[PDB]
């Protein structure tokens, strides 16, 4: 775990960072699934 001082204020801040982290993980994998779609049509054509 990342080093931090235990506080009520730090708890809510790390709570907001994880919620944005979890959604950002959702969006980057959507870009990963998307790139796999335009790559696959182009790759088969190149092959």
């Amino acid at each position: 775990r990342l080093n931090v001082n235990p506080t009520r204020m730090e708890l809510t801040r790390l709570k907001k960072q994880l919620t944005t982290a979890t959604r950002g993980h959702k969006l980057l994998k959507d870009k990963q699934d998307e790139l796999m779609r335009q790559f696959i049509l182009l790759i088969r054509k190149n092959n």
Partner: protein
């Protein structure tokens, strides 16, 4: 008269050889030099009674001092001539005006309203704020607080709401009961200077309790205001608006009293009976069946460390219908008032907004601008995660909506009164950016009526 002082521990003192003493009874210390100091009973026993002196116990000689028991608690000299007069936390005059002959003397505690006698609040209140009147509508007789923080402009907003509060077509003027609880002399002067400069003092009765005043003085300050607001509304039939700030200093005053009685605190170092203490004050409001008057309470509290799970805002949310939440992020960008509507809710806004109330498009545009902001805010974040190239033609409008809604809708100014008509029309202009296909909550019958 008693000259029997046994123990004196700080501002607290004990007086033996007592009888018939009551709790929260007013006492009066006669010092050896003739100086007179007052006190309240924090604890009574058969052979002794502890009291806290307001002015303190500095320089008091136990052997040559005396104490007088008045036999009555803190009562308010209520009268109708109080309009325009400013008192302190104990009802003493502060403006050095003419004396007020009390019509009655009522104890500041009050009485519990019968829940079946309580009436439904039905009248809309135009606070002049677009973020409130449209998305978090206040109703005449509602408990709607303002959750602020240390450093957030809650004083400017408190001076704006009481200045811009009015009822539509009622032909009767709103009554304002402002109660400053433990605020600084600067913030107190800001409130007093704003009520006098705008003529709102001609409609208001102000109670002013400073921060350096005793803790027992802070506890009675809300009880002083609500007892007068109870009298103006329920005894005279007036419509009363009650405003209180800061509410947190009232809780800290309970802690100094609770620790003075050696009571073990509850959650987070606060007294256990706080839920009863806050509800006793917050529920002295609402319209009454058979009476034309009404009491509207708007508490203002600053959350410690901006925590919502803190006992002060956690219990207030359980007692009051909704909450108005201010955020530090909106204030550092220049949004005045910095009122975030996403975490703010109004538990009685459905009756306040509609045909006859405000306009037919009030409920629909509220739900439309509400979802348009959450989608516009996530689109702006999508431009930060996936870049602007991932944003489509529709997403570029949603990101432009949120940015304008932050800067043009909510950001109106602490001295800007917007009518309900000017508020709704602005929402349509901000919603006119998105195509109709985006606006799904609003039916096309009213969408083809107001959309420019």
């Amino acid at each position: 008269e008693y000259r029997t002082i046994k123990e004196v521990v700080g501002p607290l003192m004990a007086v033996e050889k007592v009888s018939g003493v009551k709790y929260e009874e007013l006492i009066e210390v006669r010092m050896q030099n003739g100086e007179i100091r007052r006190g309240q009973v924090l604890e009574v026993q058969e052979d002794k009674a502890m009291v806290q002196i307001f002015e303190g116990t500095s320089g008091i000689n136990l052997k040559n001092s005396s104490v007088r028991f008045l036999g009555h608690p803190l009562q308010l000299g209520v009268s109708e001539d109080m309009i325009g007069r400013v008192f302190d936390g104990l009802g003493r005059p502060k403006d050095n005006g003419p004396e007020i002959l009390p019509e009655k003397y009522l104890d500041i505690n009050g009485e519990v309203i019968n829940p079946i006698a309580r009436d439904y609040p039905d009248e809309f209140i135009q606070t002049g704020i677009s973020a409130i009147d449209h998305l978090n509508t206040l109703v005449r007789g509602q408990k709607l607080p303002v959750f602020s923080g240390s450093g957030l402009p809650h004083k400017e907003l408190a001076a704006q709401i009481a200045r811009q509060a009015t009822v539509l077509d009622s032909s009767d003027d709103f009554a304002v009961v402002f109660a400053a609880i433990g605020i600084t002399f600067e913030e107190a002067e800001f409130f007093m200077e704003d009520f006098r400069q705008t003529g709102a003092i001609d409609r208001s009765v102000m109670f002013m309790n400073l921060a350096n005043d005793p803790a027992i003085e802070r506890i009675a300050t809300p009880r002083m205001a609500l007892t007068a607001a109870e009298y103006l509304a329920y005894e005279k039939g007036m419509h009363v608006l009650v405003i209180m700030t800061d509410m947190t200093n009232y809780a800290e005053a309970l802690r100094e009293i609770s620790a003075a009685r050696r009571e073990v605190p509850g959650r987070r170092g606060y007294p256990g009976y706080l839920y009863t203490n806050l509800a006793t004050l917050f529920e002295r409001a609402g319209r009454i069946r058979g009476l034309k008057g009404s009491v509207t309470q708007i508490p203002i509290l600053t959350m410690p460390e901006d925590d919502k799970t803190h006992p002060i805002p956690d219990l207030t949310g359980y007692i009051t219908e909704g909450q108005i939440i201010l955020t530090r992020e909106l204030y550092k960008s220049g949004i005045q008032p910095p009122i975030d509507v996403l975490p703010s809710l109004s538990r009685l806004k459905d009756k306040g907004t509609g045909a006859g109330k405000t306009r037919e498009d009030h409920a629909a545009t509220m739900n439309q601008l509400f979802a348009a902001y959450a989608q516009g805010k996530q689109a702006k974040e999508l431009a930060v995660v996936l870049g602007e190239s991932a944003l489509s033609d529709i997403d570029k409008i949603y990101a432009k909506f949120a940015e304008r809604f932050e800067n043009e809708y909510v950001n109106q100014g602490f001295y800007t009164n917007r009518t309900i008509t000017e508020t709704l029309d602005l929402g349509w202009e901000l919603l006119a950016m998105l195509p109709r296909t985006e606006l799904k909550r609003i039916k096309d019958d009213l969408l083809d009526k107001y959309l420019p």
